[PDB]
Design a binder for this molecule. Structure first.
Ligand SMILES: O=C1N[C@@H](c2ccc(Cl)cc2)Nc2ccccc21
Ligand SMILES: [Zn+2]
Length: 208
């Protein structure tokens, strides 16, 4: 039931998504090992992900969280990178998309930094890089990320350098506590708490 609707680059919606993607690139502590060396992207395409059933699954869960948290879903737009991007957009988020080994337990992880999600496009640690060249810093091959609507509800704050949410919380927030430039990362433990709104196709660009 999923359809992908291409956005024109002239559309304000394309432009505001491209800007969140570009403006939230940062340097990483691995010097580019996982995700490659780049300061910006070449955005090739942005598509709206349309699936009525998956949307109703999200809004239903959203209302449940909202009603457990003084009518506040605490909804964010966040990036997700995964080798399973095509299963996600067709069947929705679930336990098979969890980062079992993540620092805040087995759950589904999202980033404010687009460059952080870029590190998982080819697997944990970047895997072996692109399928074609085996290069984690490939500048040729086309990458995809999701820009997702995520319900955090009451989020457990972890200060720092599938399972269940901590009792009385709907998510975990990984607060950056050493790298002053890092933005937060977030974990949900229910796939129904994220909806993959935008499929972004891009290349990382070689710095000049
Ligand atoms: O975009 C994210 N993708 C995940 C991820 C996705 C799929 C698999 Cl298999 C493993 C991990 N990890 C992240 C960790 C922190 C912030 C963002 C992300
Ligand atoms: Zn490649």
């Amino acid at each position: 039931g999923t359809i992908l609707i291409d956005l024109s680059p002239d559309d304000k919606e394309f432009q505001s998504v491209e800007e969140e993607m570009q403006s939230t690139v940062r340097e990483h502590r691995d010097g580019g090992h996982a995700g490659g060396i780049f300061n910006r992207y070449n955005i090739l395409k942005i598509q709206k992900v349309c699936n009525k059933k998956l949307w109703e699954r999200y809004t239903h869960r959203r209302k449940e969280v909202s009603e457990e948290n003084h009518n506040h879903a605490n909804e964010r737009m966040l990036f997700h990178g995964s080798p399973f991007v095509n299963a996600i957009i067709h069947k929705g988020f679930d336990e098979r998309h969890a980062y079992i080994g993540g620092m805040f337990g087995a759950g589904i992880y999202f980033a404010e930094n687009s460059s952080k999600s870029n590190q998982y496009v080819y697997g944990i640690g970047g895997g072996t890089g692109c399928p074609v060249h085996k290069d984690r810093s490939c500048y040729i091959c086309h990458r995809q990320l999701l820009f997702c609507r995520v319900t955090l509800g009451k989020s457990f704050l972890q200060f720092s350098a599938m399972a269940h949410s901590p009792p009385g919380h709907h998510s975990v927030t990984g607060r950056p506590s050493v790298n002053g430039l890092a933005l937060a990362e977030y974990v949900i433990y229910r796939g129904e708490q994220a909806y993959p709104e935008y499929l972004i196709t891009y290349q990382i660009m070689r710095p000049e």
